[PDB]
Design a protein around this ligand. Structure first.
Ligand SMILES: [Cl-]
Ligand SMILES: [Cl-]
Ligand SMILES: [Mg+2]
Ligand SMILES: [Mg+2]
Ligand SMILES: [Mg+2]
Ligand SMILES: [Mg+2]
Ligand SMILES: [Mg+2]
Lengths: 144, 150, 146, 144, 144, 144, 144
RNA sequence: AAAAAAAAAA
RNA sequence: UUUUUUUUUU
RNA sequence: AAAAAAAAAA
RNA sequence: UUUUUUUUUU
RNA sequence: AAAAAAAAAA
RNA sequence: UUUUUUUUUU
RNA sequence: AAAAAAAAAA
RNA sequence: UUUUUUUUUU
RNA sequence: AAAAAAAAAA
RNA sequence: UUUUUUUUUU
RNA sequence: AAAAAAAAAA
RNA sequence: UUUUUUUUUU
RNA sequence: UUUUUUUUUU
RNA sequence: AAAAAAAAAA
């Protein structure tokens, strides 16, 4: 391959876009109380910590969750996810459980194409329930 | 694919496994468009700092690997003249003396030119570094720089 | 293999992913009472009921609507039925219509909702507007409860 | 594909059923005591918690069981299942044991076609024995 | 081919629809001020000038823009489009520039299927910016 | 498929037309008297009820007709169509009859290409004859 | 194809015939009385209502008949056809009956080639019988 | 799809 | 032998 | 390259 | 059916 | 895609 | 004979 | 990848 | 017979 | 291995 | 249509 | 050249 | 599955 | 030689 | 997938 700078025969000025979209997998943690559902805010996805503070909307494609702290004594870890939608919240409770007390529980859900619209900071993605005090989420989304 | 394919109309369960490897602050390949002011008979040094800005969604980055530079005259040339733009590549390990140049063949049309950086000179640059020197008979140049933010 | 006559052991492994409250794709039949040449808005709430085993849902994604006249038409007339899709992001002005060709037979028509318009609806929402010369309309709605 | 609503050339009124059958995998837990067999009530399968409170009968196809809490000190988890049937109870004790003390024991059994009749709330599916105080069941069944 | 009227052996009364949908490419102009973004209202699409005043909703599919008047002295035309959505506005700025001062600048964006819902008069399609006092838009859409 | 907006690299301003043509199947009804031929006016085709009030001319391609009310006592329904043209009315009487007293009679005719010119509201498309007091018509035509 | 008038290189004067034959299906109705046969007169086929008043002879090929009014109370419609010939009348009574009281009864008969000679107005085609007060006939014939 | 009648073409 | 109109058979 | 209008040839 | 002229489409 | 000039390889 | 740099032709 | 239950299509 | 949802088997 | 987003090449 | 970056499915 | 909407035909 | 009208992609 | 039940090997 | 023990079939 070339070892030196070489000329580019550029033509006319192209179409440009200084603020393009970005497909991402955003990892973050939330605190969870015993017996209480936590509503995961969309605003958690906008932050300089993820290079995403210039975005104000996002299209979530899928949500995966893992317990992030150990479960109570004698128990195996569990985590549940209830998808929320601005046009109407769901009542599914997708749940994963651990089969070794020392291992994380995990589960996820995919959003169908027909339900992939934008959400903003004040929106909530889903409810989390767990017997562990923290849950780690990895959200696959399209910032725009 | 996607020929009548698509998927379901409802949320479905993912049988997730172990916690994956993750990175909250990944890299990003980009083409950044910005303009610079240039003066008659004077070479302007293009600062790398122009590439870090919220106007590009890149203010969380402190380094970038530049891969190629293209330039266009952004304002009209002087009376009776055709536009021209020249690019001289600059490197922290030793500046070049190439003067890549394009000129317009219609006075009403932009001049344009570019250069590609070879793999062996694709290291990082920071805000204090410069990308290239620009010369032109037009008072502004429009640059589109293809680069890897990291 | 098959044709075992007795219980047999399953070599179960790790606890699987589970969900006590899953989705359900359904064709729901219900009727609405209608007046003469008067549009009636069909409520989405008619889809949630113990009579359909769906009272545990609060949302549903409608995929298509079909409608039949349920009582006889006025004297000298053939039955007809009209459907005008309604949407929260913007109502339609289409009026899909069927008419009977025998005075003793039901009129029928339906419409399909495109993938890009298949979002959720709740009980307070309305599915469509119905218009008929008969006093009842029998609807069958294909939908995904979730 | 189409981006607008399209006509459906409906025909005669079809056959309908407002209350159809449902093939399900129902997850629920049962309490178990030391040295004592617990009879799992079929009524545990009818509940708004599973969207099944409008069913009063169910045809069980197979039963799988996992220990749901840690076992006593120095022991590995075990769980046994003895099928019950209204026409005659079995004496099999299908059993699984853990090989790591931190992991669940698991076993299941399949009901043959000739024994897949209906059960009601007052009936029992099986007996569960375990050294763990709780057992998690996932029962494959056809509600009707 | 036939030179006279011929008989049609009609059958039963078909399905009918007096107010059908309509896929269109609507052209209209908007005024733009220096350094100010103009919100393109969706209501502009329901006009007797387009045969569309019987519609109250539309599904937008793609937007294209051209500058419609000459740029300021010494400048080449430019135009920018920022898509707007009721579920969450975008921050993209798709931009084109003229490479000949005497020629229009042009650009567009396509709306993905998952974001192709309906819009009504009070909604806005996008934000337009340009150094020219007028921008010419052609909007591909489905009236319904 | 793509889940977010994408740039379109638009070119020169296209050829446009804000008021295009429209091929349509228009359903409407006319009253008919015993023993009297009813001239169907073309103006019936231009209406807000059809989204066609912006049109002043139309090219009719075919006409199909259905009896719309029940026939006289002891009679089977019939309907006849006589095509009319500005250059010369025809004398054909395309006719259909019901074979069940409770069923609609139907018939239609097709207009040859050499006779497919424009008609305006003052023109008449055909004469309708029937023993029922209303006839349902579906006219295939090209609005321009 | 050509859009202008074009020259025809005609030759010698051709054979001509200002009054040609015509193959036709003629539809008309006759009144029928209970228990009485009605002889269908051939003269009904020559009429300006059929464009055939310039003919005096016709070769009938086949006769189809349909009851034209409702039957008496409690009965299903029926119609019978007995062929009549100048060289010798037949004694066949071809018959159709309705299987639904609201539907027409129908039947026909074909005339063999060896019996396809001419008939004049004073001739009769066939006898019609029915429990309905009117019968609708469609006669396939060759006017000459 | 074939045939008969009128017409046109070859 | 193809097509157009009327008819018929399929 | 085909088609239409005029012409020429076959 | 080939060419020439006018037109049209590609 | 080939060729010529410098270089490198074979 | 292949590649890199400059050039040229296509 | 096949099957069973619900739906849709053919 | 294909797809979607639930289940199951592999 | 294919697809989606940004980029580059063709 | 290939490659690079992010993502996803396998 | 395929697809989507309206129409027509099969 | 072919064509016509609007649209889109190429 | 196929299948069902228990076992075993793979 | 084969084999061994019981059963059933051929
Ligand atoms: Cl749980
Ligand atoms: Cl803007
Ligand atoms: Mg844990
Ligand atoms: Mg230079
Ligand atoms: Mg009715
Ligand atoms: Mg345990
Ligand atoms: Mg310009």
């Amino acid at each position: 391959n070339s070892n030196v700078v070489t000329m580019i025969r550029a033509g006319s000025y192209p179409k440009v876009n200084p603020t393009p979209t970005w497909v991402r997998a955003i990892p973050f943690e939330v605190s969870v109380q015993s017996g209480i559902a936590f509503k995961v805010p969309v605003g958690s996805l906008f932050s300089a910590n993820f290079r995403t503070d210039s975005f104000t909307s996002v299209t979530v494609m899928s949500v995966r969750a893992w317990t992030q702290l150990t479960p109570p004594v004698n128990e195996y870890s569990f985590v549940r996810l209830k998808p929320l939608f601005k046009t109407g919240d769901s009542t599914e409770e997708f749940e994963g459980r651990a089969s070794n007390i020392n291992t994380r529980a995990s589960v996820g859900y995919r959003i169908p194409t027909n339900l992939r619209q934008n959400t903003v900071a004040a929106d909530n993605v889903c409810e989390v329930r767990s017997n562990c005090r923290q849950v780690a989420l990895v959200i696959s989304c399209c910032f725009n």
